[PDB]
């Protein structure tokens, strides 16, 4: 139950209007270049990256120099989603999977239609979230300290930069208020339960990202339901069905809760009806790497939620994306 083994890694979504820098932020954290790789210059699928709590500590050290801050989660599974208006469905699915979220707003553009759509998803599903005010490097005469906490860098800026920041921030708060949300700059926020925290960030310079990370950890630990900190009954969802060399037809699955084990008899839904099979191989990508991206896999005898995993099993042809996955126990 509330044991410290059986701890669960929560799920965080990233949602936002097109080209606001979701994938870019993820690339900056991962130290990867998925964004350049994307065909057509757009994100068209749900992406999963697992972040061990160690990496989060290391990346939040600058805003946690004293070391006061307490990390209770073992890790965090982070879900990239499409921003283009066409993919409402995938945003809906991703949102359906997450426990908490990051809503990315381009500080230069403010709230845009898919920002509003995402806001409806978050509000309707009562998902705790913070807002990343991205692309602060686009403030006129912004001067950069790489991977710095926002407040430290902001203190260094000239008064013109600070003025323009406060203008754009004020406009964004007005916009959120028009959408029925009270929002606050994160260190100015006194009602964490009811007011949305705003984190200024740059995906290019990495500034404000430590603040964002420590804030999503905070979301997990103080706004998310406490039971979700621990593993309960198994829940898993199929993201994708693809043919992989030497593994045949495989499925990309989000393990939301519970534990998946090699040899588990599983059932999922195909076009015609149910598919019953056995997990032959339980795979994850390397930590800090996309499940979608092709790389050599790490084989597991078991995997604990929440994680993005690739399952190799016979007879997965016809599996449907978005279908839940169940484990069948030996006795009837």
Ligand X SMILES: Nc1nc2c(ncn2[C@@H]2O[C@H](COP(=O)(O)OP(=O)(O)OP(O)(O)=S)[C@@H](O)[C@H]2O)c(=O)[nH]1
Contacts of 266 (CB under 8 A, 6+ apart): 276, 277, 278, 279, 311, 313, 325, 326, 327, 328
Contact between 128 and Cl ion (CB under 5 A)? yes
The answer to whether 83 and 16 are in contact (CB under 8 A) is yes
CB of residue 315 to Mg ion, shortest distance in Å: 33
Q: Is the Cβ of residue 46 or residue 238 nearer to ligand X in the bound state?
A: 46
The distance of Cα 188 from the centroid of its chain, to the nearest Å, equals: 24
Q: Which does 135 bind (CB under 5 to 8 A by kind): Mg ion, ligand X, Cl ion, none?
A: ligand X
Tell whether residue 289 is a contact of Cl ion (CB under 5 A): yes
Instruction: Rule CB under 5 A: choose which of 7, 18, 19, 32 binds Cl ion.
Output: 32
Contact 81, 46 (CB under 8 A): yes
Please identify which residue in the block is written with the tokens 């593994």: 247
Whichever of 81 and 323 has its CB closer to Cl ion, that residue is 81
**Residue nearest Cl ion, CB atom distance:** 290
Q: Which stretch binds Mg ion (CB under 5 A): 21-29, 235-243, 304-312, 318-326?
A: 21-29
Query: Would you tell me which residues interact with ligand X (CB under 6 A)?
Result: 16, 18-24, 35, 42-43, 82-84, 134-135, 137-138, 202-204
Contacting residue, 80, 164, 264, 290, with Cl ion by CB under 5 A = 290
Least separation in angstroms between CB 293 and ligand X:
15
Closer residue to Cl ion (CB): 258 or 308? 308
Query: What span, in angstroms and rounded, lies between the C-alpha atoms of 8 and 232?
Result: 9
CA separation for the pair 288, 31 (Å, rounded): 8
Between the CA of residue 260 and those of 30, 238, 256, 279, what are the distances in Å?
25, 13, 10, 9
Which residue, 8 or 17, is less far from ligand X as judged by CB? 17
- Which of 23, 60, 201, 250 contacts Mg ion by CB under 5 A? 23
Task: Give whichever of 17 and 22 is closer to Mg ion, judged by the CB atom.
Answer: 22
Q: How far is the CB of 239 from Cl ion (least distance, A)?
A: 15
- What counts of helices (H) and strands (E) characterise the chain? 8, 17
- Those residues whose C-beta lies under 8 Å from the C-beta of residue 85, and which sit 6 or more positions away, are 18, 113, 114
Which partner, Cl ion, Mg ion, ligand X, none, binds residue 204 by CB below 5 to 8 Å per kind? Answer: ligand X
Supply angle C-alpha 299, 303, 307, rounded to 5.
Answer: 105
- Three-state SS for 293-322 is CCCCCEEECEEECCEEEEEECCCCCCECCC
Q: Which is nearer to ligand X, 128 or 200 (CB)?
A: 200
Applying CB under 5 A, among 20, 43, 256, 323 the residue interacting with Mg ion is 43
- Please, are residues 29 and 51 in contact by the beta-carbon 8 Å criterion? yes
Nearer to Mg ion, 292 or 304 (CB): 292
Query: Site residues (CB under 5 A) for Mg ion?
Result: 22-23, 43
Residues that bind Cl ion (CB under 5 A): 32, 128-129, 289-290, 293
């Amino acid at each position: 139950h509330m044991n410290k083994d059986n701890l669960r890694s929560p799920i965080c979504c990233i949602l936002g209007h097109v080209d606001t820098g979701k994938t870019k932020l993820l690339d900056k954290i991962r130290q990867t270049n998925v964004q350049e790789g994307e065909a057509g210059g757009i994100t068209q699928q749900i992406g999963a990256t697992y972040f061990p709590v160690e990496a989060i500590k290391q990346k939040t050290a600058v805003v946690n120099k004293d070391g006061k801050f307490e990390f209770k989660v073992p890790g965090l599974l982070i879900i990239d989603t499409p921003g283009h208006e066409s993919f409402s469905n995938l945003r809906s699915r991703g949102s359906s999977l997450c426990n908490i979220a990051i809503l990315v707003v381009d500080i230069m553009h403010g709230l845009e239609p898919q920002t509003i759509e995402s806001l409806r998803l978050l509000r309707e599903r009562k998902t705790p979230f913070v807002v990343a005010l991205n692309k602060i490097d686009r403030l006129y005469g912004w001067k950069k300290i790489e991977n710095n906490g926002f407040r430290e860098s902001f203190a260094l800026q000239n008064k013109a930069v600070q003025n323009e920041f406060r203008n754009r921030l004020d406009q964004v708060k007005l916009q959120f208020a028009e959408q029925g949300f009270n929002s606050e700059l994160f260190y100015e926020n006194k009602n964490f339960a009811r007011y949305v925290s705003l984190v200024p960030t740059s995906a290019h310079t990495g500034e404000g990202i430590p603040d964002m990370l420590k804030l999503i950890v905070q979301l997990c630990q103080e706004r998310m339901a406490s039971s979700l900190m621990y593993l309960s009954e198994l829940q898993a969802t199929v993201l994708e069905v693809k043919a992989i060399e030497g593994f045949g037809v495989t499925i990309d699955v989000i393990l939301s809760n519970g534990i998946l084990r090699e040899g588990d008899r599983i059932v999922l839904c195909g076009l015609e009806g149910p598919i019953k099979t056995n997990i032959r191989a339980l795979l994850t990508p390397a930590p800090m790497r996309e499940l979608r991206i092709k790389g050599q896999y790490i084989h597991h005898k078991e995997v604990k939620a929440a994680q993005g995993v690739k399952i190799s099993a016979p007879g997965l042809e016809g599996a449907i994306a978005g279908s839940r996955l169940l484990v069948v126990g030996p006795d009837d």
